[PDB]
Amino acid sequence: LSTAILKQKNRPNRLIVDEAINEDNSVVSLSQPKMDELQLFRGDTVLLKGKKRREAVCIVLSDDTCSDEKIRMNRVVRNNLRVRLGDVISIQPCPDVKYGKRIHVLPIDDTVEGITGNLFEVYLKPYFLEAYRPIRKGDIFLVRGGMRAVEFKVVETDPSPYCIVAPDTVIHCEGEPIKREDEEESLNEVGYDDIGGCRKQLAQIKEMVELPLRHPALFKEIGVKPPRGILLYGPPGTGKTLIARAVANETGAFFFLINGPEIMSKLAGESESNLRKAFEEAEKNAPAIIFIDELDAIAPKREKTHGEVERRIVSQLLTLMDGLKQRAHVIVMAATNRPNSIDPALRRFGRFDREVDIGIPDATGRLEILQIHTKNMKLADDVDLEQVANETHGHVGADLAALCSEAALQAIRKKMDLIDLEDETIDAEVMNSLAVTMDDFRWALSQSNPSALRETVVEVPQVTWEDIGGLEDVKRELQELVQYPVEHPDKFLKFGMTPSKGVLFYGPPGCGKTLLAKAIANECQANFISIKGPELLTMWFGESEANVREIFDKARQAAPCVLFFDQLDSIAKARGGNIGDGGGAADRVINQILTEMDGMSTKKNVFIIGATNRPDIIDPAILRPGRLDQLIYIPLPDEKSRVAILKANLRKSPVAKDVDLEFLAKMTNGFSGADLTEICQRACKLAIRESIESEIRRERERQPVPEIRRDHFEEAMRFARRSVSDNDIRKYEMFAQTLQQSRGFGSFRFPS
């Protein structure tokens, strides 16, 4: 119902575009049964409606090969109507078309080169003789003949805009050649089809800007005015300016564009004068649309604005949009990233009466965006844009355009072996062989990372679930945690429970918490934001909680997103435990975190993972379910786990077969994973020392150790030490046992 305006309803005049086998530029072919349906006689001229406000006149023809629902129509007429193959175009019989008295023709500059004879003498004169072909302004057609056929642009028609060609009509080609770049600009025009995702937002926008102008009788009869103000807000790169461009290109109303800072002037009264001139020009021109890009630049809150010029500009805008003299058929659209920065009096019904949320698209929306951006790109058959839509999580549409461009640049980089930068021009073979494969899209996906997250981008050392030894239960819990709500939300809806989204790792130092975070960062299919503990805190008042708010907002935008606090105890600590710390800035940060993780706002797919050595100081309101639901204890590895750790560290390293990792694990009791990794690194150092010593003695004699041996491990173990004492183990065990005894039951079983 909300998107009811977008439907087409299979109107009989709408017809699928299809290629025409033998038709020329001024004629098209439609099936005879369809012409029977449309009461259309053969040889009649018809007026075809196309996308982006383009009308063309072609002579209808009867074809047995053409189908009823398809219309056969060549390259020229489609490029006139700006329609791709398979699009729907409206057809109606042209009423009382009058034979053209004078028509002006201008050819395209890239085609006129290399031609000797006069273009009108060679091509225009025979084509326009006995043609009886209707033409219209804005039309580009190609006429066969000569060494090179020349594409011609119908710049002027008298009578305007459509007219039939008559022998007594004069055909002259005098004038400047029309630039091919300008023709490309005319063809590459953004329209309502170029906006992907945001179908409901685009439906509301169309209901405001299109419906009143198309059918003013609706609002006249229902006896009330349409809304006349749109505030498009959203994160950067979601397509607000793009929707403005589409509205401009695809509405009959006069479109006046305002960019925020352009209004600004030094002279007192000059900026207000620029605004008044803009609105006055819109008023003079009948129905009109004014688009104010970057509204928050020129419309800040009058209470919070110190400068007199800015306050006067806001007051001028307020008075213009809704004053004692009302607007007459003027729509004001505005786009802003920060809607709450706008002055509150602008956000009532008089001025900006509906605010449209151009939000981050879902998987289907970003698939539609990918199709939009790759329509021009020539793609292989292996390319699967649906997969790319799945793998991209927080992308907003500008990031998908970046992904497509990066894929194409990688495809071109694959072809620089054959192609020469030094050569001026490229042979046809490589250029034709040039295409984008799925590997290029995979490379672009690897590099791609949401623009909203560019601030919070950290390298991770490429850990995998293999590199972690032991912790099988924890690995499975984390994989399920991050993968279930993103892959199978269906199951959660069917069972009707929201997922649990909090994890806290607490355990002795060196035992594998930050390693598990690296594994999640590399492996899980979700965005990752890594936060060191105290990087949020700031000396400025109220800015620490502002950083907390903005980081949690970044997580919500890029959902599904994993938010990792490497040292939770620094940022999260029991409230009231400190004497100084500013005015309790630490406690205010705790309260802000509590409110962000479980507050009155609705929940997103943001999984908060915290790692701490000291889980006893943490505020108990952090550890309650709904915030850090599960407390996962990462203990010192046991003997099987130690075998696994030693195998994982030495997996990439050449090691001797005599080395008994089982014995190493049996002896190393109480060792953490970090200690065992240190043992391996020490063995490597001793081996490298022996290797360098052998190299030096060879250099001496002229003027060995392919793999780590057993003696190296013997020495390294002789150096090795235990890192976690028994006291630390006892403290961690105390916390774990308190948590276990909190249940009060060893095991739970229902009565029979």
Ligand X SMILES: Nc1ncnc2c1ncn2[C@@H]1O[C@H](COP(=O)(O)OP(=O)(O)OP(=O)(O)O)[C@@H](O)[C@H]1O
Ligand Y SMILES: Nc1ncnc2c1ncn2[C@@H]1O[C@H](COP(=O)(O)OP(=O)(O)O)[C@@H](O)[C@H]1O
596 lies in the site for ligand X, by CB under 6 A: no
Query: 420 CB contacts (<8 Å, ≥6 apart)?
Result: none
Which among 47, 40, 92 is positioned nearest to 66, based on CA atoms?
40
Q: Which is nearer to ligand X, 345 or 434 (CB)?
A: 345
Q: Give the nearest distance from C-beta 375 to ligand Y in angstroms.
A: 11
The residue at minimum Cβ distance from ligand X is 673
x/- map, 674-703, ligand X, by CB under 6 A: x--x--------------------------
The option from ligand Y, its own copies, Mg ion, none interacting with 4 (CB < 5 to 8 A, set by class) reads its own copies
Give the separation between CA 355 and CA 536, rounded to whole angstroms. 32
Alpha carbon dihedral 107, 111, 113, 117, in 10-degree steps, equals -60
- Using alpha carbons, select from 529, 610, 518 the residue that is nearest to residue 573: 610
Q: Nearest approach, Cβ of 20 to its own copies (angstroms)? A: 24
- Give dist(CA 186, CA 194) in Å, integer: 15
540 forms part of the interface with its own copies (CB under 8 A): yes
Helices and strands in the chain, H and E counts: 30, 22
CB 109, CB 55: distance < 8 Å:
no
x/- map, 260-289, ligand X, by CB under 6 A: ------------------------------
Binders in 435-464 for its own copies, by CB under 8 A = 435-436, 451-452, 454-455, 458-461
Q: Kindly state the tokens that stand for 452.
A: 């909203």
- Tell me the closest approach of the beta carbon of residue 236 to ligand Y, in angstroms: 4
- Is residue 537 part of the contact set for its own copies (CB under 8 A)? yes
Instruction: Please identify, using beta-carbon distances, which residue of 51 and 245 lies nearer to ligand Y.
Output: 245
CA angle 556, 561, 565 (to 5 degrees): 100
237 binds ligand X (CB under 6 A): yes
Candidate residues 3, 186, 241, 285; the one interacting with Mg ion per rule CB under 5 A: 241
Is the sign of the CA dihedral 182, 151, 72, 138 positive or negative? positive
* DSSP conformation letters of 344-363: GGGGSTTTS-EEEE-----H
Burial of 558 (0-12, 13-18, 19+ CB in 10 A): buried
Query: What are the C-alpha distances in Å from 133 to residues 58, 130, 153?
Result: 8, 9, 15
Query: Does 697 participate in binding its own copies (rule CB under 8 A)?
Result: no
Q: What tokens were used for 508? A: 């002795």
Question: Which residue from 216, 235, 236 is spatially nearest to 226, judged by alpha carbons?
Answer: 216
Please identify, among the stretches 49-57, 237-245, 632-640, 652-660, the one whose residues bind ligand Y according to the rule CB under 6 A. Answer: 237-245
Interface stretch with ligand Y, choices 61-69, 235-243, 627-635, 701-709 (CB under 6 A):
235-243
Question: By C-beta, is 240 or 682 nearer to ligand Y?
Answer: 240
Encoded one letter per residue, x for contact with ligand Y by CB under 6 A and - for no contact, window 364-393 reads -----x--x---------------------
Residue of 53, 199, 549, 647 that binds its own copies (CB under 8 A): 549
Residue 382: burial class (beta carbons within 10 Å; 0-12, 13-18, 19+): exposed
Joined together, the tokens standing for residue 234 give 């959203």
Smallest gap from residue 120 Cβ to ligand Y (A): 57
Residues that bind ligand X (CB under 6 A): 195-198, 236-242, 318, 322-323, 335, 345, 350, 369, 372, 397-398, 401, 467-471, 507, 509-515, 594, 598, 611, 613, 621, 624, 626, 645, 648, 673-674, 677
Residues that bind ligand Y (CB under 6 A): 236-242, 335, 369, 372
Residues that bind Mg ion (CB under 5 A): 241, 293, 335, 514
